[PDB]
Amino acid sequence: DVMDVMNRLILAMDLMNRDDALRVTGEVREYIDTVKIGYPLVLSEGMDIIAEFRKRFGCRIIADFKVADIPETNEAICRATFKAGADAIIVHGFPGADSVRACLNVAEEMGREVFLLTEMSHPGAEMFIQGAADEIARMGVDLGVKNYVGPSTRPERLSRLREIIGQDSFLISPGVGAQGGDPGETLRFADAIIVGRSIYLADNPAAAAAGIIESIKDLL
Amino acid sequence: MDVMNRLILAMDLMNRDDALRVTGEVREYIDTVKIGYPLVLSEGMDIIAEFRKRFGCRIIADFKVADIPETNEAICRATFKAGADAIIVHGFPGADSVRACLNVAEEMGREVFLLTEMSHPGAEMFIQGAADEIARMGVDLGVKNYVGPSTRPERLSRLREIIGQDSFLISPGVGAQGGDPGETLRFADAIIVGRSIYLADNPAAAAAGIIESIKDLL
Numbered sequence: 045d046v047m048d049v050m051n052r053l054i055l056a057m058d059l060m061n062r063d064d065a066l067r068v069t070g071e072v073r074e075y076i077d078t079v080k081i082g083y084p085l086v087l088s089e090g091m092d093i094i095a096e097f098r099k100r101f102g103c104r105i106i107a108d109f110k111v112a113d114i115p116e117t118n119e120a121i122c123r124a125t126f127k128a129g130a131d132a133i134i135v136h137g138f139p140g141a142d143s144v145r146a147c148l149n150v151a152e153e154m155g156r157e158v159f160l161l162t163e164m165s166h167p168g169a170e171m172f173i174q175g176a177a178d179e180i181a182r183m184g185v186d187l188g189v190k191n192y193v194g195p196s197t198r199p200e201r202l203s204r205l206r207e208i209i210g211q212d213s214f215l216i217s218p219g220v221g222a223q224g225g226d227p228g229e230t231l232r233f234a235d236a237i238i239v240g241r242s243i244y245l246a247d248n249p250a251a252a253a254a255g256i257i258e259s260i261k262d263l264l
Numbered sequence: 265m266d267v268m269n270r271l272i273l274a275m276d277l278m279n280r281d282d283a284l285r286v287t288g289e290v291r292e293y294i295d296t297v298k299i300g301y302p303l304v305l306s307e308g309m310d311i312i313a314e315f316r317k318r319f320g321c322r323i324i325a326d327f328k329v330a331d332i333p334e335t336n337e338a339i340c341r342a343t344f345k346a347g348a349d350a351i352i353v354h355g356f357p358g359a360d361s362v363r364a365c366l367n368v369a370e371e372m373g374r375e376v377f378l379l380t381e382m383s384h385p386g387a388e389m390f391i392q393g394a395a396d397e398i399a400r401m402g403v404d405l406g407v408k409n410y411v412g413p414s415t416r417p418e419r420l421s422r423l424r425e426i427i428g429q430d431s432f433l434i435s436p437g438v439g440a441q442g443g444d445p446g447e448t449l450r451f452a453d454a455i456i457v458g459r460s461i462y463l464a465d466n467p468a469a470a471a472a473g474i475i476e477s478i479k480d481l482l
C-alpha cells in the first residue's frame with residue numbers, strides 16, 4: 045500500500061522557468077509519473093504550478109518543502125500545500141516530534157501523505173544531521189510515518205535507514221547522478237530514486253531518463 | 265539593522281486582505297515585517313513587493329532554508345528577486361548549505377539570518393544539543409545575524425555570549441509561546457511577535473501594549 049512510482053524514478057523538477065520546467069517534464073512523461081516540485085520552481089512561478097502540472101501531465105506531485113518550523117507554522121504550510129493539490133509533502137525530522145506530528149495531523153485530515161527526511165545527501169549533512177538521523181528515523185517509526193527520504197550518496201547510511209524503517213515503509217532517495225549516487229546501487233535499498241540535473245540539464249532529457257531506466261531494467 | 269521599537273511583526277495570516285489590513289493597523293509601531301510560508305504559499309511571492317509598496321517596511325523572508333547548497337542558492341535567488349531584504353536559514357544542515365545562502369545574499373545586497381536553536385518543545389530533541397556549535401559555525405562563516413528562542417532565555421543568553429555584542433540577534437516565541445518581551449530584550453536586539461498581535465481583538469492596542477511594557481528599553 046504505497047504510491048506506485050513508474051520505473052522507480054522520480055523527477056526533481058528544479059528548473060525555475062515555467063516554460064522550461066513544463067517542456068522538460070512533458071518530454072519525460074512517458075517514463076515518469078511522479079514529479080518532485082520544490083521551492084526553486086514554486087517560489088519562481090507560484091503554487092499554481094502544481095495545478096498546471098496536474099492539468100498538463102497527470103503526474104503525482106510531491107511537494108519538497110523540507111518543512112522545518114514550529115508545529116503551528118508547520119500546520120499552516122501543510123494546509124496551504126495540500127490545498128494547492130500536492131499529493132504529499134516532505135518534512136524535516138530534525139526539528140523534533142511535535143513538528144512532525146503537526147504535519148501528520150494535517151495530512152491525515154486532508155487525505156494526503158507525509159515523507160520524513162532523515163539524513164541528507166550533501167557533505168554538510170555530516171556536521172549535525174548524520175548523528176541524529178538514526179534517531180530521527182526511529183522517531184518516524186514511532187509516530188507512524190510510512191514514507192521516508194534518505195541519501196543516495198551514502199549507501200551504508202541508506203542501508204541502515206532501510207533497516208530502521210523496515211521493508212514495508214516507502215523510501216525515496218536523492219543524490220543520484222549529479223551528486224555521485226548510482227541508480228542501481230541506490231535501488232538496493234530505496235523504492236525509488238530521485239533524479240534532477242542528470243535529466244533536466246541533459247541535451248535530451250527523455251534520452252537521459254531512458255538511459256537511467258535501461259541501466260536498472262532488471263530491478264523493475 | 266535598525267528595527268523600530270525593537271519589534272518585528274510575524275505576519276502569518278494567510279489571507280491577503282487580512283494580512284494587509286492588520287499590518288496597516290500596526291504600521292505606526294513597526295518598520296520590519298517577517299513574512300513566512302503561511303502567507304507566501306497562500307498568496308504568492310508578489311505579496312513581498314506589495315508590502316514594500318504599501319508600507320515601505322523591511323521584509324525578512326522566514327523560509328527556514330534547509331536544503332543542499334545548490335537548491336539553497338536557487339531558493340535565495342528567487343526570494344531576493346521577490347524583494348526580500350533578508351532570509352532566515354537553518355544551520356542544522358551544515359556549513360556548505362549556509363555558505364550557499366551567504367554567497368547569494370552578498371551578490372544581491374541582502375542579509376542572512378542564521379537560525380540556531382528553535383523555540384518550540386521539539387527543539388529539545390535534536391536542535392538544542394547542536395545549537396552552540398551551530399552558533400560557532402556562524403561565527404566561523406562570518407554570519408552577523410542570528411535567531412534564537414525567547415522561550416529559553418538561558419539559551420538565548422548563551423547564544424548572545426557566543427556571537428558577541430556586535431552581532432544582531434532576533435527572537436521569536438514572545439507572547440503566544442510564553443516568552444516575555446522585556447526579558448527577551450535583555451539578550452536579543454529585537455523581538456518577533458505574531459499571534460499576540462495579529463490574532464488580538466485590537467492588533468494596534470496589542471502592539472502598543474507590548475511597546476509600553478518595554479519602553480525603558482527603547
Ligand SMILES: O=c1cc(O)n([C@@H]2O[C@H](COP(=O)(O)O)[C@@H](O)[C@H]2O)c(=O)[nH]1
Nearest residue numbers: 056164165218219222239240241332335
Ligand atoms: O538530502 C537531500 C534531500 C533532497 O530533497 N534533495 C533534493 O533532491 C534533488 C536532487 O537533485 P539533483 O539530482 O539535481 O542533485 C534536489 O531537488 C534537492 O533539493 C537532495 O538533493 N538531497
Ligand SMILES: O=c1cc(O)n([C@@H]2O[C@H](COP(=O)(O)O)[C@@H](O)[C@H]2O)c(=O)[nH]1
Nearest residue numbers: 114117274382383436437440457458459
Ligand atoms: O524558533 C522559532 C523560529 C521561528 O522563525 N519562529 C517563527 O516566529 C513566529 C512566531 O509567531 P508567534 O508569535 O505567533 O508564536 C512564527 O512565524 C514562527 O514560524 C518561531 O516561532 N520559533
